[PDB]
């Protein structure tokens, strides 16, 4: 399900607003990309299905912390 394992970011609904302001239900998906990550701490690639925002957070926090978060809400990776 198009959900980012780092941040929760999942698709959300809104409208397309034409020039004449007609609305039409639509969605905003997030920017997912499954990406391989080298955890030094476990001599292994862990691949996460992340949003782009996802990665940036993983940078600043560090895959070790971010994974630690997953492991702490029974997220399986």
């Amino acid at each position: 399900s198009r959900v980012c394992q780092v941040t929760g970011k999942r698709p959300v609904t809104g409208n397309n607003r034409s020039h004449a302001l007609n609305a039409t239900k639509r969605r905003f998906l997030p920017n997912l990309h499954s990406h391989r990550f080298w955890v030094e701490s476990e001599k292994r690639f862990v691949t996460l299905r992340v949003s782009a925002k996802g990665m940036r957070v993983i940078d600043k926090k560090g895959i070790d912390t971010v994974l630690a978060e997953l492991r702490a809400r029974g997220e399986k990776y």
Binding site: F37, W38, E40, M55, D59, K60, G62
Partner: protein
């Protein structure tokens, strides 16, 4: 990102600088093959402790692997009890573990492979000289005097 490097790293790095690199390069190549690391600030001072230590401290300790030779010219003469054949020409002869072992064995403590008697190394009596080695650039001269007793 900023990221601080580890090894020398080609057209950008140094060995422990704070360059700034495209994240595509940092993740995917550098940091994974640990040639650099996130400049997490926590780190950038992990490196400031590493900007005082080994450098400022252990180079005035190679100012001791150097001032060992401030006691190479303040004596400037050991004698070897080596005699003389048929005209004041050594009945003995003295090399490196002779000029490092007859250097150590006093107040002049040198490492046996720190005594350059270019060969003469050696084939006669009286005064000679040698090139004493403690540092790569700072060695020092003495005077050796094979005493025919």
């Amino acid at each position: 990102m900023q990221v601080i490097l580890l090894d020398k790293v080609a057209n950008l790095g140094s060995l422990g600088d704070q360059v700034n690199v495209k994240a595509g390069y940092a993740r995917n190549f550098l940091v994974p093959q640990g040639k650099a690391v996130p400049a997490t600030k926590k780190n950038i001072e992990f490196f400031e402790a590493r900007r005082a230590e080994l450098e400022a401290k252990l180079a005035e300790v190679l100012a001791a692997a150097n001032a060992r030779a401030e006691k190479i010219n303040a004596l400037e003469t050991v004698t070897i009890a080596s005699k003389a054949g048929d005209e004041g020409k050594l009945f003995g002869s003295i090399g490196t573990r002779d000029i490092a072992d007859a250097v150590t064995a006093a107040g002049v403590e040198v490492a046996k492979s720190e005594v350059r008697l270019p060969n003469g190394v050696l084939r006669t009596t009286g005064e000679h000289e040698v090139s004493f080695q403690v540092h790569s650039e700072v060695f020092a001269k003495v005077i050796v005097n094979v005493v025919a007793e």
